[PDB]
Design an enzyme around this catalytic site. Structure first.
Site, PDB file in Angstrom:
ATOM      1  CG  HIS A  14      -8.027  -6.245   0.558  1.00 59.83           C
ATOM      2  ND1 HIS A  14      -9.455  -6.659   0.326  1.00 59.83           N
ATOM      3  CD2 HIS A  14      -7.567  -7.339   1.464  1.00 59.83           C
ATOM      4  CE1 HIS A  14      -9.495  -7.827   0.819  1.00 59.83           C
ATOM      5  NE2 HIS A  14      -8.394  -8.353   1.587  1.00 59.83           N
ATOM      6  CD  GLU A  15      -3.048  -8.069   1.729  1.00 59.01           C
ATOM      7  OE1 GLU A  15      -1.823  -8.570   2.159  1.00 59.01           O
ATOM      8  OE2 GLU A  15      -4.159  -8.425   1.958  1.00 59.01           O
TER       9      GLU A  15
HETATM   10 HG   LIG Z   1      -7.994 -10.022   2.218  1.00 61.50          HG
END
Ligand SMILES: [Hg+2]
Ligand SMILES: [Hg+2]
Ligand SMILES: [Hg+2]
Ligand SMILES: [Hg+2]
Ligand SMILES: [Hg+2]
Ligand SMILES: [Hg+2]
Lengths: 175, 176, 175, 176, 175, 176
Positions: free
Chosen positions: B13-14
């Protein structure tokens, strides 16, 4: 609480536990009696699965007419959860990776119809799986119920014990 | 509390956000990737959506539709609000036009809300597809970023770009 | 504020002024910088015209993608104004000389759809006229912008001066 | 503050109301035209609408659709409210019938509101057309009234009728 | 209060009384002037009948244009009453023996449309009966009106007296 | 205050409830017929509706559609609420499914409300027809109950059943 009602509750509480113990992912512990982070789509699907197991088992054992009021919370908890998947976390293909703004604010009735459809879809599905599961394991479930009604309270381990005596090996999720 | 499973999800996600930020031909931001009155134009805000969507986009490319997480909640809500303003506050949609909803909407027709919702859905769908495509196209070097991320728990944009230059991709500036 | 952003603002603030100075009726004074009774249907049409000139000029100079957030108020002010024409002052043929009661009260969704249509119609129109106007006078507008970006603040008179140097004679509305 | 343009508009709007009042075969009112428990029947309230609409009606005949002014705001709102009561409070519409909306309307169907809105629109459209027709038919003597109005700033109904008798029109009584 | 208005009121107040005195069931007393348990479906139908008699008589005597504002309450009282029949006491075949929950709460627009239809049906009906009644007895009603306008206030008995002089025998409901 | 007419109506309404209660193959209640955390299943609540509807059902069989009374207000409202919960709170309708309305309903589509309303209408219509059928089928012995009711003003379930055993009907237990 009359024996007829005790049988219901028993089947119901067994249903949850069954779902938990089979649930392909759903991390969660147990216990069972006649008295009472970051998740993915799979995790939440399985959480719904657990929430519907009570009612699912009720319908398997008593038909559509033996369905009880005892699943009032489970249906609300599950429906809320599916509703967040669809309106909060973009987990519906039909709806897409959109979030509903605020208790929605200024959302078209069409958007609500779409959502309601998808919530229904998700829930119908998990509920059909739970029934299937109860069905597949009806016999060893009956056994668990008997002990439940007898001893009034079962541990997670005994539930497993009974299932191992039937050749079904349940996921290692008890303590 | 964080399982290697969950920690991996976070990483991806990051890495997704940062990817979008570094490739984003417009959007500019303070990159530092960890596990622990102005004036914007249409191009700008599109790129903001792109960025906001990178996280989820990365989740889907890497884990399929079932690996999609709760972690994107804040992200999807901001994207949606932003596109919602584009359509209903600024005249940034051709279908709706340079019309501004009397904002709670007040005495707007159900028909208009539907048009707005459709256009919000179009902007987001488009950018979402863009984000995924980019993650797809850069799956390889991104894994490498993720491996170092999981290893050291916190990366700088510099290292992120360092891996990317190694693979032969020249990412844009934007760090510190 | 970066030069790229200054150029935008400049084009925007020039757009209003252009609309004001050409506006067939719209009584109103001026000034221009990079920092910031009883009306008839014609008057209000022209007021909308002025309100949309900013955005109109933005789209002429940068395309549909260079469109800015800076027109947030202008769009609201204009849309409010068209909405009163239609729902308060019976200035729409389709809708007719009817007033909406109270924030409408107990009005059919059909009436709202009709209104929203007519508001859109009025605004689309005035906005297409503003673009046309910016277009027609793009060259002398470019000239004004240059001086604007240079001196940071222009008077109404200089704006006119530049236009007279191009053979365009703007309405006498400055002081 | 008032420009000869605006002052003329006012005059015509004011001459419009009075015209309607003086010709109105029913409606009765305290005429004095300047620049500065009961029981009404269907006929009566129609004539009230007529009167309320005269101002705008006069604007349109004299200045076309573009000359229509803000000055009629109060007027259009009263007309509309009145017709709204005719339809939703008194049983004065054939389509809707002797039905009374549980008044804010409470738990009324969208279908009913639409019927009501249509009927309100019919009453007003009809009377508006009537008002215009009358102004049209009396354009000539009305100009003459307006000329004196603009000249002396305030006229009495008497003078208004005086001009009309001169043109050969016998207006009704209703003054003081 | 002008004589024209007095005539209206007279016709109106006579209309109610007529309805009351003929009303096949409606238990209720009387009096008449120019100044002012458990019911069944029949009873409430007749109550509506009485409530609409004023307006009914107005329309018979003056046409659809002589219809007055004086029936404002009667129409509200009647419509409320029909609305309870339909939404509270299951007295509509179309709608059925269902009650609306709370000022309705969370009711579909379709349910409201159905109700509004049935309310309209009931009221249209009772109102057509009231007109018919006024019609049938127009002549002796005219007589009553005359005395009313003369003496300003009539007793229930005199109303009957006048009707007996015409060969119409009204129900024994006066004191 | 109570006229022989009204008193009869009451009797029949009251005899209706008790009939339903005594025949109700499930529902259990504290019978005493006068003029003055648990767990229920689908079968149970259906029988509750049946009971709640008996009063009106009895009114209609005995007095036709015009004899229908205000007395059933409380009854119809409870029935409706109960069926409403069956559909929108418990998953007791096949059409709607094991879905629970986020209860005031919040952000539910007009489409869903309509489905719910239809299903509430189905449950009630069905049970209403059942109630009527039973009253019809037992009209004769019920009259006899009513005659004694009107005569003595208050009856016990025992007497009620006593009349029924005399006619050859074996009603279920449920009294004291
Ligand atoms: Hg996010
Ligand atoms: Hg449960
Ligand atoms: Hg502006
Ligand atoms: Hg006026
Ligand atoms: Hg009345
Ligand atoms: Hg009852």
């Amino acid at each position: 609480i009359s024996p007829k009602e005790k049988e219901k509750i028993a089947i119901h509480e067994a249903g949850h536990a069954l779902m938990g113990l089979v649930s392909d992912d759903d991390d969660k512990v147990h216990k069972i009696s006649i008295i009472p982070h970051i998740y993915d789509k799979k995790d939440l699907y399985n959480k719904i699965l657990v929430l519907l197991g009570g009612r699912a088992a009720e319908e398997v054992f008593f038909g559509k007419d033996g369905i009880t009021t005892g699943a009032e919370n489970d249906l609300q908890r599950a429906t809320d959860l599916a509703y967040r998947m669809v309106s909060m976390w973009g987990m519906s293909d039909k709806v897409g990776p959109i979030a509903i703004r605020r208790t929605a604010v200024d959302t078209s009735p069409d958007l609500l119809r779409e959502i309601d459809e998808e919530v229904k879809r998700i829930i119908t599905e998990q509920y059909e799986k739970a029934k299937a599961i109860v069905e597949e394991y009806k016999e060893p479930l009956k056994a668990v119920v008997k002990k439940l009604l007898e001893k009034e309270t079962i541990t997670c381990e005994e539930f497993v014990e009974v299932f191992k005596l039937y050749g079904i090996e349940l996921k290692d999720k008890c303590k």
